[PDB]
Write a protein that binds this ligand. Structure first.
Ligand code: PMR
Ligand code: PMR
Ligand SMILES: [Cu+2]
Lengths: 400, 424, 431, 402
């Protein structure tokens, strides 16, 4: 739904920036052209300067006018890199726009590399091109790549399917064990040691909103989805914890006792950040798909009137839980071309104008106080203890 | 195929985008995949250019991989004409549409837009952004700049400055000050502040001036024949280069070589007794070819630094680079990866390495004093403060920026020396 | 009284030397013991003045007897006369020369110097270097300057600049550019570029401009009284202050307040999504009072910094500073010792200590981002590059110089945050 | 007579406090000497130094007893804040001399009042008596009387020299069959060397004139040896010491053969730029002739005017004996004539004072700024080519910049 227009979202490879942070024993070999190489170089920023696992093998002209030579050469370069990087145990080949158009057999390449490399390096392939994906969707694809490989466990386990920082995922696990049993197995494994036992009865806890196809891939293994509004505020977090609890079985008393300290911990912080957001117009442009959750939280807690919650990729079975808390007032429009929502912003002037980084500076110069959603994925604001920090981040009431 | 981690240069369409964003009112419409708009971030943040860069990517997806891409481009051009009303418009493709041939120029002609359209042929797999920029500039000069009457006053065009360029914005101001000081009036700076009207007026000058040969040599060479316009070779970075440049444009125009150097403090501030530890320090210059060559002419001739290394990443400019490397007794490192230069400085261990952002970062990783002189930079290196790199004030800027790492090093060395001795 | 390892101000005679060497053709014949020459080194090396500071020292090695010291002072006066050929002579006493009984001006008159001789009193045990500079200025204004006819074109006087100032050179270039771009010419920048002839012409400009109040305000008041030249008050450091200064000088001269803000990058850059992390950063603000008040305005308005503490080291300007601090919700910290500054920073725990050389080091010991916004600085902070502080280009400078330490910290803290320095913690489900 | 450019003796404190640790220096004076310490230290003051100025305000001017009481209070406060002090120093300054605030009687007053662990001694860096390096001389010379005596042949080379070089020197010198060397093994405690009739002190840095007198007062024996700066200086120094202590030369020729080779090779490597350049040795630190002999002979230089603030011929005669008597010396110091002589003679290398350095360099003169050689290691063999290097630096920098 771009009306044949400029969809500002990034190609899925930008998700690799934080994925490599999550799975610290995983390398990501991207076969993109110099454009995709420049994208990784830029969007990663300071990542490049500390030996990042961001192989951006550029396919040059010799890789053109030839197919078997290309993936044979790819095999060669991979072997070279594990020679330089023996520590890596899972290599993440990723499909790029150049890789898609030249019809590179990324799956077959990953297969032969795994075969000659063995279980010591379980090289995996997925797709993160802009021809198919859009920013965060890359993380979806990357975790979906490991989903079939993960050990099959028919026992009732919980899956922490999300790349939240340690100071977030550890807190989530601690709370869940505090009220529930917590057979929590984080799907984005910190190391290959913590291989999660995905299975039929291993119901998976979805915690990052942008994860769409993830749902499908995990449900193929039988892993069911909890209809829990996304843990991103006094409503999303509380509802998510509640639903996760009753899914495994937790008394209301135990839930209240466990979440009593976090509840008061975050209520004061969110209020102390909300007065900068008290009664103003918002506008979510389709950058990264957290906007529905952000509207579910901020509109109802900090009193930010919801004008339009744009979304590049709308979902019905995943977004529904937090969709229920969403008011009908905001326009649920999907991700249009930049001109459309830009003109909407100009017409219905919003106080806060959350959008992509590319429009952030112009609309900032165009009299729109802007907060870029790009900051959201890196800054650890996806649980109870950081709900106030999220509100402070959204606040941004800079005066001159 | 080669595993790249930090490409010194973006793809060439980034260079064309730099030229388009530099000048006013020329919409560089693109046949690019959905997501390739990442380049807009560079101009909107690192250059902090307010308005969105005047570029309209078609942003095609899995839905669009056939003739629908051609229809996308058709729309993109007609839209861009009406919505983003230009006086001149570019066409071209990124890597994806380079492979999925769509006859960009043919599409543009199919619209037959009243404003001139500049067909851009940009090989996006064997060349880089410096090329891309030079090629784009050349194509728009041959499409818009036609020979015309010389301005009655002696006048010159600065060619080379380009949006998202290392202190280009300040350097135009400095060179303009110097040229007016001699008496030469600047006819039209292109392509950093020019307009298609200005590119039309290009021919009216008496002689082009090459500030940045990387983005301007092709334009100047074409102007030499089409517009009968000589172009000066000596980029004026540093005191000595400034003197040569002053004399050169003086000869070219016909005006006396008087240039006001009352703001020159570097000859005095480096000849001072304070700057005596700087003599015979080892330096590793890396980065843009012209910047590196002039920085070497400063380091070995006005500062007393001993050049122990030298290297470049502009393969296009390897020949003058190698010539200068012989000039200083060294061997030029005409490479394009950080591994080679990293190994080079590790073997060399110069006191003050300086160059691209990578040079600074792997200086820090190696704990070596670090400065910045070349093109690839981040938002910090793009300053708000007036910091040209050419002219006399450019010489002073070079001085301070280069010895700041040295002063930091000396002061920290002292502080560790002091308050610290054998316990017993 | 106290163990002074750090002293912000210097002895009064040093300020007198600042003024003297700022001028062109003014010798500061100073009674001083052998060794008090050290300040010539400060001027020669910190500021890098080519010609040696035009000051002489009647160094009395061990003839401290009043009969001898008087003779040394007289001989040095006359020798400094026919040696350096100044158009006027500046004579005073420093430290022990105050202790030693001398008539610092009577002898200078007695030698029948044809060139004017300006007698200076510098109480060397209750005043400081800023006083000394200001008082020396007042003296040379009294002696040399004289009311004459107003210039046909409104001429503004750049009162205040001296040598060894904090950027007292790029700054006057910037202010002259703004003033002449509006149209007003400058008659004579009085110190940091004014022969005694220029001081003789100080009575022809229309309206004074007090660039640096501390060193030149007393001359400004004397100008207003005797020369009947109104003096502006606001120091144009920043953008808001620059607009105010432009309007003020427009009113004092009756001209249009046109401002060449095409160079203004700081407003737009501060108002950028790149640098919204600035909001809510406590900044400690120390240094000489003028620069601190101006930095207060800039930090609170242009950058959105929440200022936590404003102190100064010159008591002479305390009252304006306490006024400003009560404005910003704080209390001024006018002191003289580095200890109280260290304590104030320690307790308040800022995130950006904009202060003098010592505050820079206090920051580095404490690991807090540092910057220099005042007068006491070593040779490093006197750059070769065009680095003004007032004017629009001054606003740009201010922006970058203040932001650069925070960015150094951020990219430093990032490289720490990054996996290269963070492969130490791990979690496996429920541990 | 005339304008003298030499600084006060307090400039001695700058290196004295580092070299003799656990020693605090109260420079009682005005804000002016306070500033001098500030500027001279430069970056030391940030590193919690062991000195400071006890400012005499007008209040502490008329009443000398009042100033004494306040000084005692200040001293108690310091030792409370600095218990690690083992020897406080009541160093007088020019105002202190004018106020005739006798710090000797004050040191008697507060000797053991606040603990006998602090041996408060008094010297005077005041510019009204001493000239620059005469400070460290005066400090150590006041140290001498409090020192104990000894009853053995003890080598009292005066410890005014960097600990690394001192360790080198003591290593070689003990290797040359010599025992007591005033080398306290830890060097972090009060050395307290014995000074008796058989004590033999070897002057190490020329400026130590009154120290020589003090040791002679204590019956100690001087060594008239050329000072250990370059190659011949260090060689003759060691040879002389070896003779007087009783050691033969046979083992000496083998002990320092390699060091002699390094010194000569490094000097030959660094004097490449130094080819017959004229040196005007301006009187700044009274250290000049010792450097001169080195330059003019083994570096290959041409001295013009080897001046000095003060001249102690009793310890300079050895060094001068190697100096070619062509080059003149200077007991008369006045910039009003020194700069004229420099300008007329056009020496290619001049050791001007720092305040005269930049001006002189502006007049087409390569100026070796002289504050280094007191502060930087320029002694003995390993650090002779270094010294030649700092001297060859200005001419090489001139060469590059034309
Ligand atoms: C692809 C272009 C681009 C550039 C220029 C970078 C680096 C950088 N991106 Mg943003 N960044 C781009 C995109 C993205 N950035 C990424 C990273 C990053 C962060 C965490 C931050 C940011 C920002 C920036 C900036 C300007 C500020 C900075 O250098 O950190 C650069 C050059 C900056 C911000 O948005 O404003 C404060 C900020 O704190 N980006 C990510 C998220 C994975 C992507 C997709
Ligand atoms: C202008 C007064 C001044 C300042 C600010 C300092 C510190 C300092 N003085 Mg030198 N210096 C001055 C005076 C003195 N310095 C002192 C200390 C010291 C030395 C030994 C050295 C030095 C130098 C300097 C420096 C570095 C900048 C310089 O002045 O050239 C400072 C900040 C420094 C240098 O320049 O060489 C690399 C050098 O090695 N200072 C002393 C010894 C008592 C003197 C006389
Ligand atoms: Cu720095």
């Amino acid at each position: 739904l771009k009306e044949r227009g400029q969809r500002e979202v990034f190609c899925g490879l930008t998700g690799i920036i934080w994925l490599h942070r999550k799975m610290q024993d995983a390398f990501f070999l991207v076969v993109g052209s110099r454009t995709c190489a420049h994208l990784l170089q830029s969007a990663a920023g300071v990542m490049i300067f500390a030996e990042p696992r961001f192989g951006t093998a550029v396919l040059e002209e010799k890789d053109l006018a030839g197919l078997a030579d290309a993936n044979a050469e790819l095999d060669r370069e991979v072997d070279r890199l594990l020679a330089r990087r023996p520590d890596i145990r899972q290599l993440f080949l990723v499909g790029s726009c150049p890789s898609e158009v030249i019809k590179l057999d990324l799956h077959r390449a990953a297969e032969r590399l795994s075969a000659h490399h063995g279980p010591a390096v379980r090289v995996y392939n997925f797709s993160g091109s802009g021809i198919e994906t859009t920013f965060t969707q890359g993380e979806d694809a990357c975790l979906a790549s490991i989903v079939p490989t993960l050990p099959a466990t028919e026992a009732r386990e919980l899956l922490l399917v999300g790349a939240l920082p340690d100071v977030v995922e550890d807190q989530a696990v601690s709370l869940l064990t505090q009220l529930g049993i917590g057979p929590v197995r984080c799907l984005p494994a910190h190391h290959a040691a913590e291989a999660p036992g995905v299975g039929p009865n291993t119901v998976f806890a979805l915690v990052q909103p942008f994860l769409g196809d993830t749902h499908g891939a995990l449900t193929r293994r039988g892993a069911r989805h909890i209809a829990a509004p996304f843990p991103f505020g006094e409503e999303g977090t509380t509802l998510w914890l509640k639903a996760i609890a009753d899914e495994f079985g937790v008394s209301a008393e135990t839930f209240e006792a466990v979440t009593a300290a976090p509840r008061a911990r975050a209520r004061k912080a969110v209020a102390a950040a909300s007065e900068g957001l008290r009664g103003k117009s918002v506008f979510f442009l389709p950058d990264s798909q957290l906007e529905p959750s952000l509207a579910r939280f901020l509109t109802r807690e900090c009193g930010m009137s919801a004008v339009e919650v744009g979304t590049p990729f709308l979902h019905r079975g995943i977004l529904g839980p937090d969709l229920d808390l969403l008011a009908e007032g905001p326009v649920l429009s999907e991700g249009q071309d930049v001109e459309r929502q830009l003109d909407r912003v100009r017409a219905a002037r919003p106080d806060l104008t959350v959008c992509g980084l590319g429009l952030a500076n112009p609309l900032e110069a165009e009299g729109f106080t802007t907060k870029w959603a790009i900051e959201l994925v890196f800054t650890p604001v996806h649980f109870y203890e950081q709900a106030g920090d999220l509100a402070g981040l959204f606040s941004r009431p800079v005066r001159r | 195929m080669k595993l790249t981690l930090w490409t010194y240069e973006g793809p060439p369409h980034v260079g064309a985008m730099r030229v388009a964003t530099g000048m006013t009112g020329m919409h560089y419409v693109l046949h690019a995949p959905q997501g390739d708009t990442y380049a807009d971030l560079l101009f909107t943040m690192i250059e902090r250019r307010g308005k969105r860069p005047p570029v309209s990517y078609t942003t095609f997806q899995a839905r669009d991989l056939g003739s629908d891409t051609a229809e996308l481009f058709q729309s993109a051009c007609r839209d861009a004409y009406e919505r983003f009303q230009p006086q001149a418009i570019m066409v071209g493709s990124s890597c994806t549409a380079e492979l999925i041939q769509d006859d960009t120029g043919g599409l543009a002609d199919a619209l037959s837009l009243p404003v001139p359209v500049v067909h851009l042929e940009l090989p996006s797999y064997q060349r880089k952004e410096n090329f891309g920029a030079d090629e784009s500039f050349l194509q728009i000069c041959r499409k818009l700049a036609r020979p015309m009457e010389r301005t009655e006053k002696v006048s010159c065009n600065l060619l080379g400055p380009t949006a998202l360029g290392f202190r280009h914005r300040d350097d135009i101001l400095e060179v303009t000050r110097l040229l007016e000081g001699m008496g030469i009036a600047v006819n039209a700076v292109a392509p950093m502040g020019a307009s298609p009207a200005d590119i039309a007026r290009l021919g009216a000058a008496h002689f082009n001036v090459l500030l940045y040969p990387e983005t301007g040599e092709s334009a100047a060479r074409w102007a030499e024949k089409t517009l009968k316009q000589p172009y000066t070779k000596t980029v004026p970075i540093g005191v000595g280069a400034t003197r040569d440049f002053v004399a050169e444009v003086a000869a070219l125009a016909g005006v006396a070589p008087v240039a006001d150097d009352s703001r020159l403090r570097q000859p005095w501030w480096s000849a001072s007794v304070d700057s005596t530890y700087l003599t015979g320090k080892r330096v590793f210059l890396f980065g843009d070819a012209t910047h590196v060559i002039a920085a070497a002419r400063v380091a070995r001739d006005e500062m007393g630094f001993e050049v122990v290394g030298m290297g470049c990443y502009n393969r296009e400019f390897a020949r003058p680079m190698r010539a200068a490397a012989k000039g200083y007794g060294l061997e030029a490192l005409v490479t394009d990866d950080y591994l080679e230069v990293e190994e080079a400085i590790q073997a060399l261990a110069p006191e003050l390495i300086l160059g691209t952002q990578m040079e600074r970062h792997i200086a820090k990783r190696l704990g070596i004093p670090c400065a910045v002189i070349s093109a690839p930079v981040h938002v910090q290196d793009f300053p708000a403060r007036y910091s040209p790199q050419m002219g006399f004030e450019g010489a002073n800027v070079l001085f301070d920026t280069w010895i700041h790492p040295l002063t930091m090093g000396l002061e920290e060395h002292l502080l560790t020396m002091f308050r610290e001795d054998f316990e017993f």
